[PDB]
Structures are given as C-alpha cells and as structure tokens.
C-alpha cells in the first residue's frame, strides 16, 4: 500500500507549515516513474524535495495548492502492506 507523503514549511522560518497524506496506490509504482525517482533505495527510505517541474504531476493527488513560491515542499514514498 504505497502512499505519498507531502510535507511543507515556510520558505523563511523553515517552520513546519503542514502535511497531507495521499490516497493509497497499492502496488502502483507508476507515480514514481512519472517523477523519475527510481524504486531502489527510495521506497520508505528518503524524503525528496519537490521541484517545480514536479508540482503539476503531484498536485493531482493532494487537496493542497502547492504554493511553491511561499513554501518549501518535500515528498516521501511510504509503502505499508494492507490499509492505513
């Protein structure tokens, strides 16, 4: 049960501003392939920084307007068997 972890902080105070989880994608690695991040050593092991180019492809899954000019965004591909 893979999910996308999105967290963001203020582009100045570095303060935690928020975090929203994504729907589960079961074993659909796809989302990762659209971003280019390889499965190897990245599933449940890493917190990549969301880069502009990515917004357009991530946004489709987070009820959150990714204001990348007002906040810093990061994403992690967490995966747990079953539901959660």
């Amino acid at each position: 049960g893979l999910k996308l972890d999105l967290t963001w902080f203020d582009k100045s105070t570095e303060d935690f501003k928020g975090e929203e989880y994504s729907k589960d994608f079961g074993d659909d690695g796809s989302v990762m392939e659209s971003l280019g991040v390889p499965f190897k050593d990245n599933v449940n092991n890493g917190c990549f920084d969301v880069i502009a180019e990515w917004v357009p492809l991530l946004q489709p899954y987070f009820n959150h307007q990714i204001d990348i000019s007002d906040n810093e965004y990061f994403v992690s591909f967490d995966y747990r068997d079953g539901d959660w």
């Binding site: 280019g36 890493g46 357009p56 946004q59 990061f74």
Partner: protein, 468 residues
C-alpha cells in the same frame, strides 16, 4: 495605464519583452496546426510524451523576456464554472513547456501523455479599461488577458526569436517540464461572469539563455544517466536502439559512397579519353612542325610559312592538352579519395554491424534474467512512523529534511522536539529513531516510537551538526 495590451494572436508563440507581459488572444476555434494534440493523445504506453511545437534561439536584446504561448481550453478533463474552493484542476495536456530535448529550448512541446496532471486556476479580476483583466498566475508576471471575438490575429510567422521549424516528431521528455521556464500552466478561464469570459489556458515559459540551456541539457543528462543505472533492465534496450540505427546509418553511407566511386570512375574514363585526344592532335601538330623544319632557316622560301604555321598549330594544340591534363589529374584525385573513402565505409560498417550483435544478445543478458517488483522494493526499508504516532518524547513538529541518506536520493525524516532542542530522525535502516541535540547536533541516542524508551545511549562519534 496598466498592462500595455498589444497585437491579438491565436495559439502561437508570443515573445513579450518582460515589462509586465500582456496577452491579447484573438478568439477562434483551435487551428489545425496546434492540432498535433490529436496524434499526441494517441494511446501510448504509460508515460509523459510530447511533441515539439516551436523552437527557441538567439533572439535580440540583452534582456530577458518569455513567451506567453496561450491557447483556449481543450485540455481540461471536463470543465465547468466549478466552486471557488478548488484552485487546482486537471488537464490532459499542458502546453507551454520549456523542454530541452536535443540541444535547445523547445518553446513548447506536447505534454499530454499517460500521466495524470493538475493545474492552478487563477480567477481574473476586473480593471480600468473595458475588456482587460489581470490574471496573476502565482509564479510569474501578472499578465492581463484580452480575449477578442473579432478573429483578426497575427499571421506573420512567429516573432523572430521563435522558428516553427522544429522536428515535429513525437517523443518523450524528463524533468524539464517548466524548469527555469514552463512553470505557468494554469487555467485562468475563470473570468468574472459578464466579460470576455471563456475557458482559456495560458502558460508562460522563460526564454532560456544559451548557458542556461546547457545548464539544462546537462541536468537532463544527469538524471538520464542515473535512471539508466537503476534500470539496466531496459537501458540495454535503449542501448540497442542506439546500435540499430547506428548500423542503419553506416549503410546509407557505404551506399552513397559506392555512388561516389561511381561518378568517380565515370568522370575518369570520360575525362581520360578526352585527354588522349588532345595528345594525338598535339603529336601530329608536333610531328608536322618536324615535316617542315628543313625550311626553317630559309626566311624566303614560302615553305618557311608552313613551318611557321605548324609552330602556331602546336602551341595551341599544347595548351589544349594542358587543360586537358588538369581535368584528368583532378579526376584521378577524386577518383582515388573515393576508392579509399569507400573501403572506410566498408570498415566502419563491419565495426557497427558487429557492435549491434554485442548489443543485441547482451540485451537478453539483462532481459532473460529474473528481476523483482515494487512490492519487494517496499519491504527493503522499515516504514517511517506517523509524526502523530511517535510516542513518548512529548510533541513533535516535523522539520525540513537535510541529513543526506546513504543510498537512494532523499534525506532522512526529521522532527523537532523539546520545544526545539532535541531533533529526531527516522533510521529506516534498523527501524528506530535517533536523537540529536539542537545547538550541538550530537547524538543523544536511539528511542522507540511506540514508547520513547532508549535502547542505546549517547555515542559521541555519531552526530549531525550539519543542519541548522
């Protein structure tokens, strides 16, 4: 006044000079040109493919100005005047996209393939003049659109700095999406309720500089190389397709050369015999002057005329053979260079012809063998704990990642603590937390989320005073 609106236009590349960017779209149904979207959407393997629309290049003035390639909404998965609560909407294709394919700024390309996509919705506000409206797209210039029914646009081939002469084929495209450019796709269609209203999709991409382009292809290459390593399973194939046309190439060569050796031996024989002729006329003209030399020192004999005449006959006869000689020689040169440059193609060919083999059976040598899937990759690392499920350490406020992992590519999960004194980070390697003093940055120990119980004391060696 406000945005100095300009010349209307349909769905082309529009270089505006920074200032404030103003857009004046000349309303009309999508043109058949930008219709490539059709062939694009053509059901392909899941991915994000595209098509180079226009091309960018060495423009003019020492100032930076982007291209406001707008174009009505025909990219929305379904549109309506939805509720204001939503600031992001999907779309099947995103226009304006700085994609640096082979070696330049693709002022636009066709992003629309098997890959979901959402975008912003800025609702335009009224303004001073009649049909002008600021539609401040979050990341770039404000830009005030000016939609107009009167289909009178700008037909002239796109402003100088943008040649529509792009290899209009259909291929794939990485990050490069809006890097240093694109970053604009957003349906602004939300015009009030009584104005030039319409479903419009404007995207502003920045006209990259020569350097930046390089500063772009490189990265594109960086990420390509990396993924390549992670995916040998295919890369070899990406390596085979590279050898296929490689040989396909060396053949078109060996051919077009056989042809050269052709026209070679062709102009030889011709120019060759063309010469032989001259020699003969010359010889005679020569042997003729001998047939009369006897009258040479006989100034008054009439036969001396004959001699004199043969003199002149041969001179000319000689210079002819001269140019005939040049011609022939030159021919003999090309004739050679040819015969040799051909064997080259012959050499080159074999070299390639083989290498494909060393890139074809080597494909199965990484295709044939068993690889495993996503589900496995998931089990390779103990899953991080939910900030709110981290127990016994007080409250926790996640914090910007900064600690470089060891393998992979992202940082380690960090969360503040002790009202900002104690830092924690998930160690996915053994499945356990790790403490670090704020100021110091030194390792306080390893605790357990369920509880917060230590399991290991401070280790002075371990510390990460590497993150503010």
């Amino acid at each position: 006044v406000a945005a100095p609106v300009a010349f209307g236009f349909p769905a082309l590349s529009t270089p505006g000079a920074g200032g404030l960017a103003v857009s004046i779209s000349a309303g009309a149904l999508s043109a058949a040109i930008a219709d490539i979207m059709a062939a694009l959407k053509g059901p392909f393997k899941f991915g994000l493919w595209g098509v180079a629309l226009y091309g960018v290049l060495p423009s003019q003035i020492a100032k930076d100005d982007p291209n406001m390639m707008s174009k009505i909404v025909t990219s929305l998965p379904a549109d309506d005047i939805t509720e204001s609560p939503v600031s992001s909407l999907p779309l099947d294709k995103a226009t304006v996209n700085v994609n640096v394919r082979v070696v330049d700024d693709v002022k636009d390309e066709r992003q629309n393939i098997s890959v979901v996509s959402g975008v912003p919705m800025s609702v335009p506000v009224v303004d001073a003049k009649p049909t002008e409206r600021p539609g401040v797209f979050t990341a770039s210039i404000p830009g005030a659109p000016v939609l107009n029914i009167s289909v009178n646009n700008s037909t002239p081939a796109v402003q100088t700095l943008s040649p529509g002469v792009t290899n209009n084929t259909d291929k794939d495209v990485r990050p490069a999406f809006g890097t240093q450019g694109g970053n604009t796709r957003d349906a602004v269609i939300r015009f009030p309720k009584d104005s030039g209203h319409n479903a419009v999709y404007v995207s502003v991409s920045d006209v990259l500089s020569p350097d930046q382009v390089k500063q772009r292809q490189d990265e594109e290459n960086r990420r390509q190389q990396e993924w390549d390593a992670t995916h040998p399973v295919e890369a070899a194939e990406r390596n085979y397709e590279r050898a296929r046309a490689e040989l396909n190439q060396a053949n078109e060569d060996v051919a077009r050369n056989q042809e050269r050796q052709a026209k070679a031996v062709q102009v030889y024989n011709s120019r060759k015999s063309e010469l032989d002729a001259a020699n003969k006329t010359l010889a005679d003209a020569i042997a003729e002057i001998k047939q009369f030399n006897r009258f040479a020192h006989d100034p008054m004999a009439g036969g001396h005329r004959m001699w004199q005449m043969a003199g002149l006959k041969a001179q000319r006869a000689q210079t002819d053979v001269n140019n005939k000689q040049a011609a022939f020689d030159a021919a003999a040169k090309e004739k050679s260079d040819a015969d040799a440059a051909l064997s080259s193609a012959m050499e080159s060919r074999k070299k390639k012809e083989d290498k494909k083999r060393s890139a074809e059976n080597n494909l199965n040598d990484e295709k044939n063998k068993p690889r495993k899937g996503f589900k496995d990759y998931g089990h390779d690392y103990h899953p991080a704990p939910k900030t709110e499920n981290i127990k016994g350490l007080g409250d926790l406020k996640p914090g910007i990642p900064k600690t470089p992992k060891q393998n992979g590519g992202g940082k380690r999960k960090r969360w503040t603590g002790d009202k900002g004194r104690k830092i924690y980070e998930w160690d996915s390697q053994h499945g356990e937390l790790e403490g670090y003093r704020a100021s110091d940055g030194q390792h306080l120990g390893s605790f357990d989320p369920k509880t917060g119980n230590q399991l290991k004391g401070p280790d002075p060696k371990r510390n990460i005073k590497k993150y503010l």
